[PDB]
Design a protein around this ligand. Structure first.
Ligand SMILES: Nc1ncnc2c1ncn2[C@@H]1O[C@H](COP(=O)(O)OP(=O)(O)O)[C@@H](O)[C@H]1O
Ligand SMILES: Nc1ncnc2c1ncn2[C@@H]1O[C@H](COP(=O)(O)OP(=O)(O)O)[C@@H](O)[C@H]1O
Lengths: 558, 551, 116
């Protein structure tokens, strides 16, 4: 009445006016809500669901059913009133403000006799008012909830229900759980088709079928922080607002792609569902940052095509490849380039090295974990497993079962899925055909051969040839120049200087890892001390040259 | 009734009272994005205080009046709601909200939205009805504290971030507000003055944030010029780098000589300012000098820490005191050196704490020391790799800790000129085997310290005995040390394995203790210089037969 | 003329309902009428609490007719004063530091005559 208005909104009258969005496919949940609400004693349903599934939508659909008249006589003409605890908890800086406001609300409800409370965030009922031992909202609602005279509808989250409500057995035995699970893709499509009328009326834009299809099919697999259909609705609504400010039209896959690219930072052309054509040109998209290794690039490319086609059994991880060969070939940067191509983010790959995690205590950190939390934050991620030679038997068995069922059971009590995770095992263990037979006999005596059976591909990297080392020197000087062009410094690298950079950079015993150290010592430090001591300044080209070896060497920055 | 209980921004733009905004195009268009929606249509501006959260709303009002808004925001009047004008309180608030809803074209700016979450009993259901469209303004910690845990507001409030403006953006903002400040103070300000003010507000000031932090310096310099300037005289005034430097000197208590001059020359007179404090280690001094010159000068990747040093040598023989010397030069304070020892952090529970975040946030222009990195945890190793690679720190709190201006020194006792060449060879070998090559691959430099020689240990002895020399001058006494006593005390304190730390015990036992007994004996007491000496000694013996003598 | 403000004098004897509001408004009117009075409100943190004593000063300080000088501890400033929109925008923290030892010697030398 006159006191519920300052604390809540009349859902039944608002549905009578025609303000509420219609609900699609929630017939079972709303029917269960009528089932619980029709009981004599303890007629209080609590909607349990993840944030963003539509619990408030279920309640609003119940109000829509009540106002039209598809309810039994026990729910006919019942004013559904929402109620928030935050408008009662706040302002309780004295002894009894909370109890006074809640007693006034309960008295108005009892006098009206046709009020149902939709108290959202039920788990704060125990924590409201005073502490859980003294008089709180639960202590004043419990003597009236148990006899079924105060009809209330709660809404909460699953973990918060288990942790707050289930601890209080007296309160737990008063609320009937109603599960509202996350809708699938097709139900989200139906929801978007239902709400397209309201959104096209509000935004003054025409939404196509491909627009809602693209919105759902991109929100579901790219955004994992929330749950459908809140994310798809957010995508459509943000795209409509973007169109509305750009007009001062229609919404298609382009608008949804650009808004999700703004949200995530992934480029728009990736988000356009041209997956096959992207898969057609990935040879040069991978070769644009890698040097040589043409057989390796071809092998990994045909592996990516054979795995991403979807023709395999969908009970396995997407791919699982062993990378063998001497260090310094560029396996890590290859994995990074794969992460950049497949998903559009350099941080989409996880870099974990288990050579420091040996015992079972560190295996508790491994799985039971940062890997589990990152594959829960995004299950479309390439994992990198370095140095699998020194593994413990527990790590071996966990890897066996994980790659077996595509599923990991951690120490956190969660079954985390690995169906699209790309596993890369960069192993330094162990001409191209000969390397197959050398490792085939050697891994089967070091590991079990079930490893070699279950794995997908073995890709062997050969040593970097001198001209490929030259192009790597070119690539590193490219980014060095990119970071020093602010001071108008131009670097020219003569062939003899390139040969010295290659010889002081390439350690055949250790590979091409030590380049990053030496190119900063023999080039960047000398250039730094030459700028500091004012031998050269901004705006002059330095064509660096070298004496004492043309085919103890000093670098002259001419 | 709205003007009696609030201030109109859209109507204030025709009067032109509102200050112009510069460079907030992306945040203003994000605000129009959020305001032009149907769900989550109320934006909340998130940023540090003094960053420009209200400036975005002012720019939105200016754009509304100029006519660069969609049809929904056309003829929309922004009203800042002030609680000062507001039984009577609830009814007057309901009346003004009812007037807003009756008009239907009023957008409320409620700065500091934490004031709602004692009006929460009124505005919360009203915004639930959708008849109030509001722009909020809070900070990040408050938004993660009140709004994020209040489940009733994520359905109606959407976050948009107002990040820290860059230095060049701050310069552009100052150039834009030049006309307003030149009009108010009747002073003339040059471009170099604003560039200097922005740079020094970024560099010597921590407690505030840009662009408030530099506009405060500009206003303060204008005020100082008006104070020092005020028969008739011409209006010839020019705020320049000198006035800004003097204002910041009065602010942060930095002396007026060389506070802001050539940082190149400041880095180039490294050696003698170490030499008044450091003892020996001239090769180490010039190595660390040339490293901090070649790394801090912007020649390194700008998205990386200013420097990363390895200090190889025995514990407490000069590495740590050199770190305090570097802190006293570059950053001016010994307490600016945050002391983090990996010996205290040996378990995962302590490793996850990395008392380091709030200390480096207390002064971003501060040196970070990691002592005894050999026994650090693996989580510490991974966090160090992350910090060195991306140039950022991602704490458990969830803020990007700025590490451009922090310089890292790893102090360790690993490995402890041809002999020193073999020393460095086996040090890098043990860093290849006991440590791993990539950690060093992301280290700017390594310097290995040298064992201190005879004149070095004598120059240690005389300076540290100068402490009790000053304590003795405080009692109208004087202390003299001869060369024989110096050499014998160095020989007694000679322990290259433990360094010069046992020399403290030898000093404390032989000199201060006997002198403290002797002054109480009152024979070499006040009114006479005391000159220590050694008898029954030739100059070569261990010192078992030699006795200290006091005159 | 620099006047320090005694809130106890304002609140003492204000038995009736509007006496405190009348006293504060009369003080502000007198200050803006004479036109040469600076205010020093020591213990600015306790200004909240006489409608309050501070709530009367919010509309004035926003409009700039009132100029005041406060004095606060470092810890109390970060807890009482800055938690407002019309005050954090209108108050400038001027840090006064602990005097140096030699500066304390000069301070004592300047106070020698009165103690002697
Ligand atoms: N069946 C449905 N029909 C229409 N919209 C729905 C449906 N299910 C969920 N939604 C939308 O999902 C959003 C989130 O639902 P709501 O229950 O209000 O919050 P939460 O799900 O986070 O508790 C709402 O804006 C609602 O419009
Ligand atoms: N882009 C900009 N252009 C012009 N002035 C700005 C800009 N950003 C901030 N300012 C100025 O900086 C001042 C600082 O405002 P701020 O303290 O952030 O407001 P609040 O206290 O609401 O956070 C404002 O008065 C504003 O005029």
């Amino acid at each position: 009445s006159l006191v519920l208005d300052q604390f809540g909104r009349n859902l039944t009258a608002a549905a009578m006016e025609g303000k509420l969005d219609p609900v699609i496919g929630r017939e079972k949940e709303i029917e269960r809500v009528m089932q619980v609400l029709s009981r004599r004693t303890k007629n209080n349903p609590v909607l349990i669901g993840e944030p963003g599934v539509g619990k408030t939508a279920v309640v609003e659909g119940l109000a829509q059913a009540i106002v039209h008249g598809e309810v039994p006589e026990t729910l006919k003409d019942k004013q559904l009133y929402t109620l928030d605890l935050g408008s009662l908890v706040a302002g309780s800086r004295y002894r009894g403000d909370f109890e006074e406001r809640l007693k006034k609300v309960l008295k108005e409800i009892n006098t009206r006799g046709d009020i149902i409370l939709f108290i959202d965030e039920l788990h704060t009922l125990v924590g409201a008012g005073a502490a859980e031992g003294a008089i709180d909202a639960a202590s004043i609602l419990k003597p009236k909830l148990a006899r079924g005279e105060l009809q209330t509808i709660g809404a909460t989250t699953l973990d918060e229900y288990r942790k707050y409500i289930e601890k209080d057995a007296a309160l737990e035995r008063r609320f009937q759980p109603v599960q509202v699970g996350e809708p699938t893709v097709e139900h989200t499509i139906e929801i978007l088709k239902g709400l397209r009328d309201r959104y096209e009326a509000h935004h003054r834009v025409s939404i196509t079928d491909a627009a809602m299809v693209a919105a759902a099919t991109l929100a579901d697999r790219y955004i994992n922080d929330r749950f459908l259909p809140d994310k798809a609705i957010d995508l459509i609504d943000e795209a409509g607002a973007r169109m509305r400010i750009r007009r001062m039209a229609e919404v298609d896959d382009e608008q949804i792609a650009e808004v999700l690219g703004n949200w995530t930072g992934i480029p728009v052309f990736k988000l356009t569902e041209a997956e096959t054509t992207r898969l057609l040109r990935m040879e040069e998209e991978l070769h644009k940052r890698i040097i040589g290794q043409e057989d390796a690039v071809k092998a990994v490319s045909k592996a990516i095509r054979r795995t991403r086609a979807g023709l395999k059994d969908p009970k396995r991880p997407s791919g699982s490849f062993i990378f063998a060969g001497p260090s310094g070939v560029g396996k890590t940067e290859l994995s990074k380039a794969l992460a950049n191509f497949l998903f559009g983010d350099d941080d989409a790959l996880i870099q974990i090295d288990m050579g420091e995690f040996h015992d079972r205590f560190t295996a508790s950190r491994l799985f039971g974990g940062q890997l589990t939390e990152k594959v829960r934050r995004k299950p479309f991620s390439v994992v990198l497993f370095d140095e699998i030679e020194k593994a413990h038997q527990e790590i071996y068995n966990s890897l066996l079962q994980v790659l077996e069922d595509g599923r990991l059971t951690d120490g956190q009590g969660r079954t985390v899925d690995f169906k699209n995770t790309v596993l890369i095992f960069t192993s330094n263990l162990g001409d191209y055909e000969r390397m197959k037979q050398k490792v085939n006999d050697e891994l089967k005596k070091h590991f079990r051969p079930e490893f070699l059976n279950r794995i997908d591909d073995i890709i062997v990297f050969h040593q970097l040839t001198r001209e490929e080392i030259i192009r790597m020197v070119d690539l590193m000087i490219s980014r060095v120049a990119g970071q020093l062009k602010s001071k108008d410094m131009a670097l020219v690298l003569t062939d003899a200087a390139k040969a010295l950079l290659a010889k002081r950079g390439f350690d055949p015993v250790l590979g091409a890892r030590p380049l990053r150290r030496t190119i900063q010592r023999e080039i960047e430090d000398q250039l730094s001390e030459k700028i500091l001591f004012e031998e050269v300044g901004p705006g002059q080209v330095v064509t660096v040259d070298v004496d004492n070896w043309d085919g103890d060497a000093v670098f002259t920055f001419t």
